[PDB]
């Protein structure tokens, strides 16, 4: 049973958490082909293995920058979580290594691109299209939460689309192992639950709120709470007033009202029946949960190898490796 499934998932997770591999490869084994994304977080590049010819998404982190930004713990934790989890909609870490100046996480490449760009390009997704993605997130959170892992950064920008049109969740720098409450202020403005913003001790239910935000944006083409800057966004979020596009179905609106619920005693995913209130909701009546997990549902939309047509362009910058080792002790466990 699904319960029985989660059972084994936990054992395998605890098992892999103890044991994390280090330097399973080296930079000389990869040919950089294109920078797929860059920013404060660092940068991800499409690379091609010089021996097999296979492609991967390599995330490069500048050690001195990570320290400067005080993300040492987060960086070590994402690697640790990544190699310890296993679910069809969670991206996998295939190689990791470091040199004098940088840290490298070589992960599965998602040819389809960022869900973000497709959403902005197309405008909005039809309810069935939105439902197909939503279903994947529900299962992923069911899985993560059973391991006491809170994702804490759900958004179109972190959801990649693979060759079959399914989702690959990326970026676990904010994910945290927590049984009850936690207190760190983190996440993305538009997707923050009210309790996070109010500096209260919160729980995994913030991911469910985020799901509501995600479904709304996918279906409307824009987030439920927006403003010129974070401060104003927070005001609207805590006020909890949401208005739905007229094209939103009665079932979709009901689901969203229960997901975007400030009252934690009433928010779906946080009640006695757990994720079942979501999975059994009218809007998901036609959803075949088992078929989704098994990837037997033909994706509503499906964007040679090494192709990067689905990603945006960024200026290619050097991969400088210093002569002196930098921040050796800080990243000794990486």
């Amino acid at each position: 049973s699904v319960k029985e499934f989660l059972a084994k998932a936990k054992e395998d997770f605890l098992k892999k958490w103890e044991s994390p591999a280090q330097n399973t490869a080296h930079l000389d084994q990869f040919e950089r082909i294109k920078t797929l994304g860059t920013g404060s977080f660092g940068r991800v590049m499409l690379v091609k293995h010089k021996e097999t010819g296979n492609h991967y998404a390599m995330k490069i982190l500048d050690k001195q920058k990570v320290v400067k930004l005080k993300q040492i713990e987060h960086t070590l934790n994402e690697k640790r979580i990544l190699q310890a989890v296993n679910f069809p909609f969670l991206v996998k870490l295939e190689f990791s290594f470091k040199d004098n100046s940088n840290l490298y996480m070589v992960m599965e490449y998602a040819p389809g691109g960022e869900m973000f760009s497709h959403l902005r390009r197309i405008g909005r997704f039809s309810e069935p299209h939105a439902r197909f993605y939503a279903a994947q997130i529900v299962l992923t959170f069911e899985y993560l939460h059973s391991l006491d892992l809170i994702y804490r950064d759900l958004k179109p920008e972190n959801l990649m689309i693979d060759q079959q049109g399914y989702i690959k969740v990326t970026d676990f720098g904010f994910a945290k192992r927590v049984k009850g409450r936690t207190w760190t202020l983190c996440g993305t403005p538009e997707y923050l639950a009210p309790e996070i913003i109010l500096s209260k001790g919160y729980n995994k239910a913030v991911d469910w709120w985020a799901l509501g935000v995600l479904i709304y944006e996918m279906a409307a083409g824009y987030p439920p709470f927006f403003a010129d800057q974070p401060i104003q966004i927070y005001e609207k979020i805590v006020s909890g007033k949401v208005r739905f596009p007229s094209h939103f179905s009665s079932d979709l609106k009901d689901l969203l009202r229960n997901l975007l619920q400030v009252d934690l005693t009433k928010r779906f995913g946080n009640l006695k029946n757990g994720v079942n209130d979501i999975k059994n909701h009218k809007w998901f009546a036609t959803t075949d949960w088992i078929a989704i997990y098994q990837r037997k549902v033909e994706a509503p939309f499906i964007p040679g190898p090494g192709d990067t047509s689905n990603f945006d362009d960024y200026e290619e910058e050097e991969i400088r490796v210093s002569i002196n080792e930098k921040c050796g002790k800080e990243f000794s466990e990486f």
Binding site: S40, L69, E157, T188, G221, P223, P245
Partner: peptide, 19 residues
């Protein structure tokens, strides 16, 4: 329109996590 207001907000591009 609500959509118009969204654009006017100016946060239509990729959003960063808060730091």
């Amino acid at each position: 329109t609500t959509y118009a207001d969204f654009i006017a907000s100016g946060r239509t591009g990729r959003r960063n996590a808060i730091h």
